[PDB]
A paper describes a structure:
Linking actin to extracellular matrix, Filamins (FLN) can simultaneously bind actin and the cytoplasmic domains of transmembrane receptor integrins. FLNs form a homodimeric structure (dimerization occurs at domain 24), presenting an amino terminal actin-binding domain (ABD), followed by a chain of 24 immunoglobulin (Ig)-like domains. In the 16–21 segment, domains 16–1722 form an interacting globular domain pair, while domains 18–1922 and 20–2123 form intertwined pairs.
Here, we present the crystallographically-resolved atomic structure of domains 16 and 17 of the human [name], and also how skeletal dysplasia associated mutations interfere in the structure and function of both FLNa and [name]. The structure of corresponding domains in [name] were not known, however based on 69% sequence identity, the structure was believed to be very similar to the one of FLNa. The electron density of following amino acids were not seen and thus not included in the final model; chain A 1739–1744, 1849–1852 and chain B 1739–1744, 1820, 1821, 1847–1851, 1872, 1873. Another difference is at edge of domain-domain interface, R1789 in FLNa16 is substituted by K1745 in FLNb16. While R1789 in the isoform “a” points inwards in most of the NMR-structures forming interdomain hydrogen bonds, K1745 in the isoform “b” points outwards in the crystal structure. The Cα-atom of G1834 points inwards of Ig-domain 17. Also the side chain of S1902 is not present at the Ig-domain 17 surface, but instead it is masked by nearby amino acid side chains, especially those from P1903 and H1898.
Residue numbers in the entry: 1744 to 1848, 1853 to 1911
The structure:
């Protein structure tokens, strides 16, 4: 299972940053959270279930603005199409947001939220391509990925764009 790894720009001070991942079964687990003493923290988690997970991050008991987040965990042994990367989950407004589509196996992409974002992918020639978008305004962005008039697993995705 591809690990969840994310840098969030939240500056931890006197309070404790905590987290909770909710799995599709109903099980909860605690992600690993590391304060990079510096304006940020890093959240990591190793999935054991397939599909849509919720990540909650809190500071002093209360959700950060960047929280809750959604992420979709692909089945590894699965051939056929997939997407993954931080731009499906979270980004900062006016910084670049990126994810990967795997196509080692007709691709339709749209990104729609607060501001007009016009995706195009760039083929890595390694059976994957890389989408990068510029969400200029903060909000919730829906990212639609289809392979044959059909949503791939996780599509449409929702990525949360903040600025702090």
């Amino acid at each position: 299972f591809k690990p969840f790894d994310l840098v969030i720009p939240f500056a931890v001070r006197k309070g404790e940053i905590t987290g909770e991942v909710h799995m599709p079964s109903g099980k909860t687990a605690t992600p690993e959270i590391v304060d990079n003493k510096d304006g940020t923290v890093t959240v990591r988690y190793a999935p054991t279930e397939v599909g849509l997970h919720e990540m909650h991050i809190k500071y002093m008991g209360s959700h950060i603005p960047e929280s809750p987040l959604q992420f979709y965990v692909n089945y590894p042994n699965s051939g056929s199409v997939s997407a993954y990367g931080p731009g499906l989950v979270y980004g900062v407004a006016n910084k670049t947001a990126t994810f990967t589509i795997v196509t080692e196996d007709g691709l339709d992409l749209a990104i729609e939220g607060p501001s007009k974002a016009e995706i195009s992918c760039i083929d890595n020639k390694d059976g994957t391509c890389t989408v990068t978008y510029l969400p200029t305004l903060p909000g919730d962005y829906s990212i639609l990925v289809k392979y044959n008039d059909k949503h791939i697993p996780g599509s449409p995705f929702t990525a949360k764009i903040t600025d702090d």
